[PDB]
Design an enzyme around this catalytic site. Structure first.
Site, PDB file in Angstrom:
ATOM      1  N   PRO A  69     -19.847   5.244  -7.203  1.00 13.35           N
ATOM      2  CA  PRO A  69     -20.083   5.282  -6.002  1.00 13.35           C
ATOM      3  C   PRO A  69     -18.776   5.575  -5.302  1.00 13.35           C
ATOM      4  O   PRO A  69     -18.517   6.452  -4.166  1.00 13.35           O
ATOM      5  CB  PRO A  69     -21.152   4.159  -5.439  1.00 13.35           C
ATOM      6  CG  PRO A  69     -22.198   3.896  -6.120  1.00 13.35           C
ATOM      7  CD  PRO A  69     -21.293   4.201  -7.309  1.00 13.35           C
ATOM      8  N   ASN A  90     -16.195   7.108  -6.774  1.00 14.79           N
ATOM      9  CA  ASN A  90     -15.873   9.159  -6.661  1.00 14.79           C
ATOM     10  C   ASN A  90     -16.634   9.476  -5.957  1.00 14.79           C
ATOM     11  O   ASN A  90     -16.975  10.731  -6.272  1.00 14.79           O
ATOM     12  CB  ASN A  90     -16.084   9.091  -8.098  1.00 14.79           C
ATOM     13  CG  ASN A  90     -14.828   8.030  -8.939  1.00 14.79           C
ATOM     14  OD1 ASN A  90     -14.050   7.464  -8.014  1.00 14.79           O
ATOM     15  ND2 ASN A  90     -14.863   7.263 -10.074  1.00 14.79           N
ATOM     16  N   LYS A 117      -2.282  16.354  -3.442  1.00  9.93           N
ATOM     17  CA  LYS A 117      -1.909  14.852  -4.535  1.00  9.93           C
ATOM     18  C   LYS A 117      -1.433  15.318  -6.020  1.00  9.93           C
ATOM     19  O   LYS A 117      -0.931  16.417  -5.918  1.00  9.93           O
ATOM     20  CB  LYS A 117      -3.641  15.315  -5.180  1.00  9.93           C
ATOM     21  CG  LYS A 117      -3.376  13.611  -6.451  1.00  9.93           C
ATOM     22  CD  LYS A 117      -5.201  13.209  -6.886  1.00  9.93           C
ATOM     23  CE  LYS A 117      -4.584  12.790  -7.634  1.00  9.93           C
ATOM     24  NZ  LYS A 117      -6.377  11.917  -8.188  1.00  9.93           N
ATOM     25  N   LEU A 148     -11.565  15.524   2.312  1.00  6.73           N
ATOM     26  CA  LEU A 148     -12.619  15.190   2.726  1.00  6.73           C
ATOM     27  C   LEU A 148     -12.739  13.952   2.852  1.00  6.73           C
ATOM     28  O   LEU A 148     -12.033  13.609   3.433  1.00  6.73           O
ATOM     29  CB  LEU A 148     -14.249  15.580   1.433  1.00  6.73           C
ATOM     30  CG  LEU A 148     -15.986  15.221   2.409  1.00  6.73           C
ATOM     31  CD1 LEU A 148     -16.178  16.823   2.800  1.00  6.73           C
ATOM     32  CD2 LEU A 148     -16.398  15.568   0.863  1.00  6.73           C
ATOM     33  N   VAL A 177       0.901  10.814   1.636  1.00 10.43           N
ATOM     34  CA  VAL A 177       0.323  12.019   1.831  1.00 10.43           C
ATOM     35  C   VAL A 177       0.267  12.480   2.723  1.00 10.43           C
ATOM     36  O   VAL A 177       1.039  13.214   3.864  1.00 10.43           O
ATOM     37  CB  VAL A 177      -0.823  11.628   1.971  1.00 10.43           C
ATOM     38  CG1 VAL A 177      -1.678  10.515   1.021  1.00 10.43           C
ATOM     39  CG2 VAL A 177      -1.941  11.587   3.625  1.00 10.43           C
ATOM     40  N   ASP A 207     -15.956   8.112   1.239  1.00  7.55           N
ATOM     41  CA  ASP A 207     -17.137   7.754   0.136  1.00  7.55           C
ATOM     42  C   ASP A 207     -18.146   7.370   0.967  1.00  7.55           C
ATOM     43  O   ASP A 207     -18.257   7.439   1.528  1.00  7.55           O
ATOM     44  CB  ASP A 207     -15.970   7.131  -0.678  1.00  7.55           C
ATOM     45  CG  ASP A 207     -15.646   6.175  -0.406  1.00  7.55           C
ATOM     46  OD1 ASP A 207     -15.828   5.541   0.340  1.00  7.55           O
ATOM     47  OD2 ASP A 207     -14.941   5.429  -1.182  1.00  7.55           O
ATOM     48  N   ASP A 240     -18.226   8.842 -15.530  1.00 11.02           N
ATOM     49  CA  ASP A 240     -17.801   8.316 -15.019  1.00 11.02           C
ATOM     50  C   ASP A 240     -18.001   8.213 -13.570  1.00 11.02           C
ATOM     51  O   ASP A 240     -17.305   8.301 -12.379  1.00 11.02           O
ATOM     52  CB  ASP A 240     -16.613   8.661 -15.443  1.00 11.02           C
ATOM     53  CG  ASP A 240     -15.481   7.458 -14.336  1.00 11.02           C
ATOM     54  OD1 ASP A 240     -15.202   6.518 -15.056  1.00 11.02           O
ATOM     55  OD2 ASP A 240     -14.620   7.637 -13.274  1.00 11.02           O
ATOM     56  N   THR A 287       0.653  -1.147  -0.456  1.00  8.31           N
ATOM     57  CA  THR A 287       0.401  -0.158   0.300  1.00  8.31           C
ATOM     58  C   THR A 287       0.569   1.629  -0.257  1.00  8.31           C
ATOM     59  O   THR A 287       0.772   2.006   0.800  1.00  8.31           O
ATOM     60  CB  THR A 287      -0.644  -0.340   1.151  1.00  8.31           C
ATOM     61  OG1 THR A 287      -1.840  -1.152   1.329  1.00  8.31           O
ATOM     62  CG2 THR A 287      -2.140   1.074   1.337  1.00  8.31           C
ATOM     63  N   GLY A 330       2.422   4.549  -1.055  1.00 11.21           N
ATOM     64  CA  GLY A 330       1.787   6.003  -1.079  1.00 11.21           C
ATOM     65  C   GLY A 330       2.834   7.080   0.136  1.00 11.21           C
ATOM     66  O   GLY A 330       2.849   6.358   1.149  1.00 11.21           O
TER      67      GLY A 330
END
Lengths: 288, 77, 321, 253, 69, 284, 138
Positions: free
Chosen positions: F118, F120, F21, F71, F6, F74, F115, F2, F4
């Site tokens: 749910p 997104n 991002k 936010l 942020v 999702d 596109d 996993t 990455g």
């Protein structure tokens, strides 16, 4: 149309009995034919067939009724001239052959068919009989004008009927086979059967063998200068079956006595003759 | 036919210097307003509390990558 | 200039360089051009691959003088309403189309010069085959997957047809012992290629014997999914003389090993035996008879019009892409 | 469905004023002239034709060219690379299967390396600040056409592109679009500007008189212009070959 | 590799579809569809009576069979 | 595992939600991606409560930085948490209201999403939901565009039958599918492939035909040998839902694109004119 | 050698025999000043030019560009030229002219075609709807 038809008929009269007309006249005729076919030429086709039948019947009326030696010097000339002039005519009316005859009859083939219907006249048997009479010089006499024979031979080869039989394929020698070759072969057999026996009843067999070989080579040569090439095999078979194959007993007796004689050369010619025929040597070897 | 030139080749290292001096404009304002070392991917002293949130907390969109026998019958699986 | 003065042959010459939509378009100009839009010389070879259409439209098109009518997988489930003259079509392809029995009966009761055919996957019936019997010139045929007709109809059909070069009466799912019996009893004597697969519990020994002692010119044969074929069947094939392509795939009653005998037939070229030969042993078979080709052609070839848009070597010119 | 057409029209009318470039910008450049950008845009339309692209790509490319030069000066040799980069941007934004960078560094006769193209790409993105969804005339024309035959549209786009060849930059893209539509409609069939357009966009003939007469006179002078790549391109039957018709000598306004 | 699908049926027929891998799917004919012997040779394994009856152009690697009730 | 990294920031702001991002840019392969350009250009032009906001664009030599708006949660995970409980009806109505508002704005501003799913849709801890994933956006003026859209689970019979023009009525279909999905916690059309998808759609809504869909037989990939299914009663398709919602869904999953209601037209439904604004009940 | 080909009005153009051999009609006429009363000098010169251009051929559909530009001339001459080619019966020239006319008809509507070719429409206004009804399946 009508006004075209008179001049066209006059021109076609001109092309027959040829006087070697000038290309201007020929283009005038071609332009007439093309002009009528642009406005669908069934009517002109019918008129052409009618005219050819008329002219050829009228020509038949004269010149016929000769029975020999002059039916040839008439027939070959007429056939040659008619063939040439009809070829030219097919040249003229070439627009029909492309656009209406294609929905079914070409002019040249129509002319050949009409001349065939001139063939089925006494002009068929008379000429064949006269040719047989002329070749009756198989004996001797250098009077055989080969140009009086080869013309008729080629004509019989050519007239093989083709009017929508299947298509133009190649050699169509039906008429030749069924109207000239049979009579020729039968007469050949008859004459040879007569002459060989009458010669045997007067001479010792050696001269018979010599004459047989000479006639064999002569009749093998004759086809190469007179008749169509698809004739050599059957003629060879028949002349062998007549000159030999029907005096084998005399051959056996002379074989015995030549073994009593001292000739090793008639040996060879005898062997060649008997080899020309089937299964001969067994009787030759067995008494040997 | 379309393979055409207009003026021939021209000098290039002056172009490189010119464009890189152009690109030296987002070096003072970037540090000022966002107080982050973008060119080095490094955070800075603060004014923007920098953390490294675990991957399962924020929705995945923020890090999504771009784009005889043997009879004739049915044998179940 | 008044181009309406052109001669018909030149107008046809011009029209014979178009494509079907534009040739349809020019038909609506003036009555003469309307005549020349249908003159039986442009409509040699048509094509309607998968294009939906209607029975009267297709009947009118065929009556215009079609020869090589190709229309696979197009749907015509609507009634046919008009009468016509006997058609002129020669190479009719109708495989797989969803078509109605009445419409197919109507359309087939007009064609009689059929030189070739194909009716793959359809459903037929007694009037269908009875009318189809008239075609005494069928070089080829095909009925794969079809179903519905009866023994008397089959025997009448096969007796009436004699020149039949290749037959493919495969996989029909309503035959019986009676059907297959009458088929092998009344098949013609000229069959070059024949397929009779599928009939698992209905192809029997006497049947194959009768076939081989009747027809001596089988070049391609196949009897796949036949479960009653044995050694004496193999020698039955030895009585055959020109068997260049055999296939006994999935013939379960046969040991892998007796297959080595098959190479003793001289003129064999291929043998497709899927299902019986387990893995590995295929190399054994190949090395045992390395003068052949084993398991190399997955698909049949017996009277399948297309194996490439050309039907049976004939190329269609009028098309719709 | 007209559920959004008027809203999009109003929104575009609002946007067009934000992206309008400077008019007197050209003199500021020390060694470039309007004739020179005319040659460049001619080369540009040639390239756009031969790669089989869309004309909206051309409009966006020229718009980026303008908003770049009007906001930044450069020495002589770089106009070609700038045009190629504008082509790349417009193609990637709009066209479905954009050509690769290799084709563009090739069509310049291999005169520049790929890396310089990438660097000036960064540069053009920098000065524009990633604002590429600019409005252009063709959208307005296509909206207008809803209120007609293919020849009308071919002539209209012809006049618009002739305008973008090089005195029109005073007028807004909607203004040029309307003038070209009216003039082409009159030329093809003599019909006049309909009332529905005056209702929709609010323009009247008088408001568009100056650009209309400019389009007329330049249409007259175009066939004798030094450059006619657009003319030969619209000679093609795809556009109905309408580049060959006569420029009307006087209008009936 | 060979992935089958569940049975979904209407009031008169009952269906199924089957997917293929690349090597097997590269074999399918694009001109004519098939028959029971044909796809059994391909390597499908199922009951008696299923009829191949459709080809889908965008994706050739999917077969559709049906058989009556 | 996993991989990455942020970063966030929380110093002094009411709208203090931020997140960084970073998108990789390989030096010499097509340069800046087309998706990146479309995203940035179409995003820094829109502003709305129901849409994620972009705050800045940072362009390094080989990387790009986008200062998005953070936010909480999702939709996929939120439904998975409440997979056995269900979703309160007023919360559903509020979510649908915000979604329709966002769609109306995006389609008014000539932008196509294409596109929506749910995964997104992003919700806040106060009931506000916003869209995202504008990498597939395109500015339509209708031409023929790209023939690859949202996902085989949420496509529309416009694209599945290979139509040529797919103007802005596909987002309505996707929205309807999402709405029914969250109502019943089950995706309506769980397709294996396109054919399974079409067969499932037919099984739920009956076989299309000229009467239902004009000009359907002429579509490039229609074959009337399809199964002859019948439109089942719409009730048991969506049991826990009332009559007025059934009417809205029936006129929002209609076959013919022309007979499919738009956004603003959908804003005026009775079922819909009753409007609440609750807050999510579970952790975000 | 050479032949004196005389047009309808005396414009005698001497041309090589191997060149005029291309035309089938002249070929057969020569087989056994020649006036061609259906061709004027204007068409004849162009025909001679074309034949000389194709004089050494081996002996859509890839129209040669030489002919194409040679065919880039107006209607009436194309009509007269097709008639002349038919009258002299030359295969390739007639084929290329026919193909060019075909490609030139491609694209236009019945109204445009009827307008450009000076074709007199008839039996209309009541039946064209029917004839289009015969052609939905297009």
């Amino acid at each position: 149309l009508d006004q075209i038809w008179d001049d066209l008929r006059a021109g076609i009269q001109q092309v027959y009995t040829r006087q070697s007309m000038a290309k201007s006249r020929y283009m005038e005729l071609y332009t007439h034919v093309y002009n009528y076919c642009t406005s669908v030429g069934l009517e002109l086709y019918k008129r052409l067939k009618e005219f050819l039948k008329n002219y050829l019947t009228n020509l038949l009326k004269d010149g016929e009724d000769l029975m020999d030696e002059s039916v040839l010097k008439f027939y070959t000339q007429q056939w040659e001239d008619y063939r040439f002039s009809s070829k030219v005519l097919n040249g003229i009316c070439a627009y029909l052959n492309r656009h209406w005859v294609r929905r079914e009859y070409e002019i040249y083939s129509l002319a050949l068919v009409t001349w065939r219907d001139c063939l089925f006249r006494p002009l068929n048997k008379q000429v064949t009989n006269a040719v047989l009479k002329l070749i009756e010089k198989e004996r001797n006499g250098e009077t055989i004008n080969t140009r009086l024979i080869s013309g008729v031979v080629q004509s019989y080869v050519e007239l093989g009927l083709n009017e929508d039989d299947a298509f133009a394929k190649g050699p169509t020698l039906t008429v030749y086979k069924e109207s000239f070759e049979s009579q020729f072969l039968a007469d050949t057999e008859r004459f040879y059967t007569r002459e060989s026996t009458e010669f045997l009843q007067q001479n010792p067999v050696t001269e018979y063998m010599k004459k047989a070989e000479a006639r064999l080579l002569e009749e093998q040569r004759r086809v190469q200068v007179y008749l169509h090439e698809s004739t050599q095999d059957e003629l060879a078979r028949k002349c062998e079956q007549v000159l030999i194959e029907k005096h084998l007993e005399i051959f056996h007796t002379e074989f015995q006595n030549l073994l009593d004689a001292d000739k090793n050369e008639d040996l060879g010619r005898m062997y060649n003759l008997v080899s020309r025929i089937q299964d001969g040597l067994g009787e030759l070897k067995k008494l040997l | 036919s379309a393979c055409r030139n207009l003026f021939g080749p021209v000098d290039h290292e002056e172009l490189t210097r010119d464009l890189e001096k152009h690109c030296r404009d987002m070096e003072e304002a970037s540090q000022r307003k966002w107080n982050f070392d973008f060119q080095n991917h490094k955070p800075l002293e603060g004014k923007y509390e920098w953390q490294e949130v675990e991957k399962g907390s924020l929705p995945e969109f923020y890090y999504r990558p771009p784009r005889a026998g043997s009879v004739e019958q049915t044998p179940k699986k | 200039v008044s181009w309406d003065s052109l001669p018909d042959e030149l107008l046809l010459g011009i029209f014979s360089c178009l494509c079907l939509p534009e040739l349809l378009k020019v038909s609506g100009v003036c009555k003469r051009w309307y005549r020349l839009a249908s003159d039986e010389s442009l409509w040699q070879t048509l094509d309607l691959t998968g294009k939906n259409l209607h029975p009267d439209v297709t009947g009118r098109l065929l009556s215009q003088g079609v020869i090589a009518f190709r229309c696979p997988r197009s749907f015509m489930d609507q009634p046919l309403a008009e009468h016509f003259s006997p058609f002129r079509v020669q190479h009719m392809d109708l495989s797989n189309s969803v078509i109605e029995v009445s419409t197919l009966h109507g359309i087939l009761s007009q064609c009689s010069k059929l030189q070739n055919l194909s009716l793959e996957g359809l459903r037929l019936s007694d009037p269908i085959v009875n009318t189809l019997a008239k075609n005494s010139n069928l070089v080829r045929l095909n009925l794969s997957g079809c179903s519905g007709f009866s023994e008397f109809a089959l025997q009448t059909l096969l007796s009436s047809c004699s020149r039949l070069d290749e037959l493919n009466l495969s996989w029909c799912f309503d035959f019986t012992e009676k059907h297959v019996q009458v088929a092998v009893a009344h098949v013609s004597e000229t069959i070059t290629q024949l397929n009779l697969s599928g009939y698992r519990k209905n192809l029997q020994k006497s049947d194959l014997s009768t076939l081989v002692r009747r027809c001596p010119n089988l070049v391609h044969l196949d009897l796949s999914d036949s479960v009653m074929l044995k050694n004496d069947c193999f020698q039955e094939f030895f009585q055959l003389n020109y068997l260049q392509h055999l296939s006994l795939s999935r013939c379960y009653d046969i040991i892998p090993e007796t297959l080595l005998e098959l190479g003793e037939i001289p003129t064999l070229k291929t043998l497709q035996v899927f299902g019986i030969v387990p893995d590995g042993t295929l190399q054994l078979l190949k090395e045992a008879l390395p003068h052949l080709q084993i398991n190399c052609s997955h698909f049949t070839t017996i009277a399948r019009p297309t194996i490439n848009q050309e039907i049976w070597g004939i190329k269609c010119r009028l098309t719709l892409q | 469905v007209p559920d959004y057409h008027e809203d999009i029209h109003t929104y575009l009318r609002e946007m067009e004023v934000k992206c309008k470039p400077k008019v007197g910008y050209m003199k500021k450049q020390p060694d470039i002239t309007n004739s020179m950008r005319a040659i460049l845009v001619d080369w540009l339309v040639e390239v756009g034709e031969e790669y089989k692209l869309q004309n909206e790509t051309l409009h966006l490319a020229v718009n980026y060219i303008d908003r770049f030069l009007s906001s930044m000066s450069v020495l002589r040799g770089k106009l070609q690379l700038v045009g190629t980069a504008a082509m790349l941007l417009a193609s990637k934004f709009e066209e479905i299967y954009p050509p690769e960078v290799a084709e563009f560094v090739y069509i310049t006769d291999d005169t520049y390396t790929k890396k310089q193209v990438l660097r000036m790409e960064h540069l053009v993105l920098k000065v524009l600040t990633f604002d590429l969804a600019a409005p252009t005339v063709n959208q307005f024309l296509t909206q207008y056409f809803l209120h007609a035959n293919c020849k009308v549209e071919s002539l209209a786009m012809f006049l618009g592109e002739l305008s973008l060849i090089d005195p029109y930059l005073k007028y807004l893209p909607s203004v040029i679009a309307g003038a070209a539509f009216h003039l082409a409609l009159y030329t093809v069939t003599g019909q006049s500007w309909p009332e529905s357009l005056i209702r929709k966009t609010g323009y009247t003939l008088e408001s568009l008189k100056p650009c209309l007469m400019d389009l007329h006179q330049t249409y007259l002078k175009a066939p004798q212009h030094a450059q006619q790549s657009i003319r030969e391109k619209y000679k093609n039957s795809k556009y109905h070959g309408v580049s060959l018709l006569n420029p009307p000598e006087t209008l009936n306004l | 590799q060979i992935y089958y699908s569940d049975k979904y049926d209407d009031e008169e027929f009952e269906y199924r579809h089957v997917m293929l891998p690349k090597d097997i799917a590269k074999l399918v004919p694009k001109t004519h569809l098939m028959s029971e012997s044909e796809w059994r040779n391909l390597g499908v394994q199922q009951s008696q009576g299923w009829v191949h009856y459709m080809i889908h152009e965008p994706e050739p690697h999917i077969l559709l069979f049906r058989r009556p009730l | 595992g996993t991989y990455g990294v942020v970063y966030k920031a929380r110093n002094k702001l009411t709208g203090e939600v931020v997140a960084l991002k970073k998108i990789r840019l390989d030096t010499e392969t097509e340069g800046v991606p087309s998706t990146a350009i479309r995203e940035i250009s179409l995003l820094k032009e829109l502003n709305h409560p129901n849409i994620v906001k972009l705050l800045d664009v940072i362009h390094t030599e080989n990387k790009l930085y986008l200062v998005f708006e953070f936010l909480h949660q999702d939709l996929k995970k939120f439904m998975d948490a409440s997979a056995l409980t269900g979703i309160p009806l007023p919360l559903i109505k509020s979510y649908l209201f915000q979604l329709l508002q966002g769609l109306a704005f995006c389609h008014s501003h000539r932008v196509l999403h294409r596109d929506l799913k749910p995964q997104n849709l992003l919700i806040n801890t106060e009931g506000a939901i916003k869209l995202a994933d504008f990498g597939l956006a395109r500015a339509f003026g209708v031409r023929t565009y790209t023939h690859e859209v949202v996902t085989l689970w949420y496509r529309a019979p416009e694209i599945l039958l290979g139509c040529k023009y797919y103007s802005t009525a596909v987002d309505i279909w996707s929205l309807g599918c999402i709405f029914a999905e969250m109502v019943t916690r089950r995706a309506l059309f769980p397709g294996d492939s396109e054919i399974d998808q079409l067969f499932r759609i037919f099984r739920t809504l009956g076989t299309p035909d000229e009467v239902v869909w004009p000009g359907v037989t002429s579509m490039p990939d229609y074959k009337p040998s399809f199964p002859k299914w019948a439109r089942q009663d719409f009730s048991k398709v969506v049991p826990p839902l009332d009559e007025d919602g059934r009417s809205l869904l029936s006129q929002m999953l209609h076959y013919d694109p022309n007979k499919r209601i738009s956004a603003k037209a959908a804003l005026a439904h009775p079922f819909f004119q009753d409007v609440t604004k609750p807050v999510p009940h579970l952790r975000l | 050698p050479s032949i004196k080909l005389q047009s309808s009005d005396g414009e005698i153009f001497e041309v090589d025999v191997e060149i005029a051999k291309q035309s089938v009609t002249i070929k057969t006429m020569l087989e056994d000043p020649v006036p061609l009363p259906n061709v004027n000098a204007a068409i004849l010169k162009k025909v001679i030019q074309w034949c000389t251009h194709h004089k050494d051929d081996p002996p859509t559909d890839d129209i040669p560009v030489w002919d194409q530009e040679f065919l880039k001339v107006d209607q009436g001459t194309l009509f007269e030229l097709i008639l002349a080619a038919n009258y002299l019966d030359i295969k390739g020239l007639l084929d290329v002219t026919c193909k060019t006319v075909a490609n030139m008809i491609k694209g236009k509507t019945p109204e445009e075609i009827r307008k450009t070719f000076n074709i007199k429409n008839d039996f209309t206004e009541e039946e064209e709807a029917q004839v289009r009804k015969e052609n939905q399946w297009c």
